[PDB]
Amino acid sequence: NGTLLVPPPRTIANQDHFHRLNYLYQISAYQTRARQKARTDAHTPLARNYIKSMDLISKKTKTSLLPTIKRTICKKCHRLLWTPKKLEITSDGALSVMCGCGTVKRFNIGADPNYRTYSEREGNLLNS
Amino acid sequence: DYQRINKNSKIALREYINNCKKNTKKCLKLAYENKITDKEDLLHYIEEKHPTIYESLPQYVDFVPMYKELWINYIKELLNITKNLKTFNGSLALLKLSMADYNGALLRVTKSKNKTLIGLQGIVIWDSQKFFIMIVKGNIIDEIKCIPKKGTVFQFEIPISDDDDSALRYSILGDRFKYRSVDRAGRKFKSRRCDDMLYYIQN
Amino acid sequence: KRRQVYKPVLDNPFTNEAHMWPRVHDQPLIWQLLQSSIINKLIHIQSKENYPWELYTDFNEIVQYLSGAHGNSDPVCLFVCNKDPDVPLVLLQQIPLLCYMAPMTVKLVQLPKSAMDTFKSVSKYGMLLLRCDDRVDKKFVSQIQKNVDLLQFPWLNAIKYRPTSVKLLKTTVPI
RNA sequence: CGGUGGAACACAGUGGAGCCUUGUCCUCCGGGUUAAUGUCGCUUUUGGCAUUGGCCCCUGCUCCUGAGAGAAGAAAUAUACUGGGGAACCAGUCUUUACCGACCGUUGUUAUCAGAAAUUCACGGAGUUCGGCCUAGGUCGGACUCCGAUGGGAACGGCAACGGUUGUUCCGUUUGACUUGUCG
RNA sequence: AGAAGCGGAUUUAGCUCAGUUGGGAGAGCGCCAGACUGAAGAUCUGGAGGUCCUGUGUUCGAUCCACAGAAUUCGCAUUU
Ligand SMILES: [Mg+2]
Ligand SMILES: [Mg+2]
Ligand SMILES: [Zn+2]
């Protein structure tokens, strides 16, 4: 089919960008969890901001993420869904996950099992 | 009510930083009504007599370990700062600091055009385009502090894991870079006239 | 001509540790009692399935039960099968997450055997949530849950910086 | 960057030639009222649909031009939408007593991968309505609505170019005073 | 050291200059190195070498597109 070339020289600029993205994601997630465990929604517009900036940096250097991150974050307001509103299933569709802002992220689950994403398949992925 | 606030994240962030300043002013008024100078007694006084006012108050004692450890460990991983210091490379480190985001940094106003802005340490909750947002504690003050960047000099310490032997201190200038973090991810910084920096020689 | 290019993609650095399913051992001592009890429920009458032992086997009822509607029953136990094909991964990446924010003492048990496709093919979906309030079953459930089947969280408990994880995916590009 | 002193208030400043779709006193679409006709249900009569005819629907200000600045209570808290600013606000698309609103059409582009799909191609599932075989309501076709892991993404959304405006295009000046030469 | 006002063209590696559906940042010369020669030139191969004038904003992404701020340089029946 073609040529098989596997380079492990990672580039320094991409490592800087993905470390910046991962630091923004970690600080937003830890702010959200440290606020959520103790008491009510104090600075929930704060951490979301980081994610939005993160997504804008994901728009800059043409970078792509795993579907775990984009499944975690929202699409319109770009907030973390670690505490969502409601989870419904088999309500004449497949699945529904409601949020506080009203934007839902549904998944086709009533069709068939044993479906994996392209990054979750057996050999398509090499760690580090 | 809750849906109309978080429609835009910027406007809700502005509403939150206004609510923190209003709650800090109400805290100063209730503290002068309390006539107790101790802040640890003041927080319990607010918990006893003002439940709804206590809900939007910041927690700096919580804010320090949740930010400083992550920031220092991220810089120790990113700039390759290890036990072996004699293999360091400064130019690539300054390029990485030009590429790294300063959201969540501890930073100190060391020199400024205004004589009252200096001496302020604080941790970044958000980076604006031409201003700067930190948080600092006083005796009883817990106000979100906005500081201009046009004509100010900022500094931050990068510690090393050894105790009292060696540590690093770097400095940035907010009048030099005046953009969002999004543009700063892609921007290659270039030369300027730098004529308005006489204050850095003056004071 | 087709050429294969490896593209660097940022991983969720803690999803492996957030999906560290709990340590389970000496598990064939448990499926005997569990399967015998579930069959003895499912034989007689559909009302008598849930009348002496209250259990919910629909995920919408799991969310509505853990939302905060019923707060009396504090020890509530859950059984979820992993390492099993024909099981949806969309729910399975969110089942141990939703039980963490529940204020009730919810005890997740991960069943490790791959051949256990019986409970999915028989009851509803392959998961079981029930209450140990005054039932006889708790008289052994409290016995073994302290031994090997402990469920605790190390990842959110203490303050710790997490190292970054950048993986790389395959891409076939025709020219 | 602009325009004026050439145009005399649109008298397109005027004239001539060529071409055509031969310059249509035309038409905003659209919304409301009134009159007439035909069908369908209540039965002095009214209601709904379609056609035809008539009316009503908003130069923000100064200025020849270029341009300048004012306000968005006819649906909001941020005073139409979108992005930023630290806030007066700025930029772009717009509207201005709109007592009804109106983002013009065509062409191409959004590279590789991904995904069913990079432009209302198509495909898969659910619901409704109609027709044929048929009558425990099974199947087939057509129409509408909603959803489908991916990516900034499915949004008739973003970018670039061109015009139907009172037919297009070309050519010439309406700009001078003294000195000299010719002609009457 | 021969202004002032007007139109056109134009800035990319040290230099001279390309180039652009908008998705890679280049060629010649020069420098270094290899090859070659008794030695050198020429020829040939490879590497080093970037503020794409600067800034805003559009976009998912700018040498390119829009705006703003600088300028480079030619011509004005000339060789001063
Ligand atoms: Mg002048
Ligand atoms: Mg001038
Ligand atoms: Zn959301």
Q: Say how far residue C14 (Cα) sits from the centre of its chain.
A: 18
- Which positions on strand E lie below 7 Å from a protein C-beta? 23, 51-52, 54-57, 60-62
Strand ranges across the sheet with B167-173: B121-123, B106-112, B152-159, B167-173
Listing DSSP states for C82-133 in one string gives -S-SS--HHHHTTHHHHTTS-SSEEEEEEE--SS--HHHHHTSSSEEEEE-S
Domain ranges for chain C = 1-21+160-175, 22-159
C-alpha distances (whole Å) from B202 to each of B109, B110, B171, B196, B197 are: 16, 14, 18, 11, 9
Residues of A in contact with C168 (CB under 8 A): 125-126
- Which of chain B's residues have a Cβ under 8 Å away from the Cβ of A47? none
Across the interface, whether the CB atoms of A27 and B104 are under 8 A apart is answered yes
- Nearest partner of B12 among A112, C151, A100, A120, judged by Cα: A100
- Nearest nt (C1') from B129 Cα: D85
- Any idea how long chain B is? 203
CB contact at 8 A, C120 and C126: yes
How far separated are the first and last CA of chain C, in Å rounded?
5
* Dist. CA A61–CA A64, nearest whole Å: 9
- Rounded to the nearest 10 degrees, the angle between the axes of helix A44-60 and helix B9-34 is 150
Q: How many residues does chain A have?
A: 128
Sheet holding C2-10, edge to edge: A2-3, C2-10, C166-174, A125-126
Check if B89 contacts A (Cβ < 8 Å). Answer: no
Q: Are A25 and A52 in contact (CB under 8 A)?
A: no
In sequence order, the β-bridge partners of residue C174 are C2
Helix (H) or strand (E) holding B178: none
Structural determination approach: cryo-EM
- Angle of the B90-99 helix axis to the A12-38 helix axis, nearest 10: 50
Resolution in A: 3.5
Is residue C19 within 8 Å of C157, Cβ to Cβ?
no
Alpha-carbon distance values, B199 to B110, B111, B149, B177, B195 (Å): 12, 8, 13, 17, 10
Q: Note residues around ion ligand 3 (Cβ under 5 angstroms).
A: A 74, 99, 101, 103
- Distance (angstroms) between ligand 2 centre and the Cα of B193 equals 26
Rounded Cα distance, A105 and A16, in Å: 31
The Cα B48–Cα B104 span in angstroms is 32
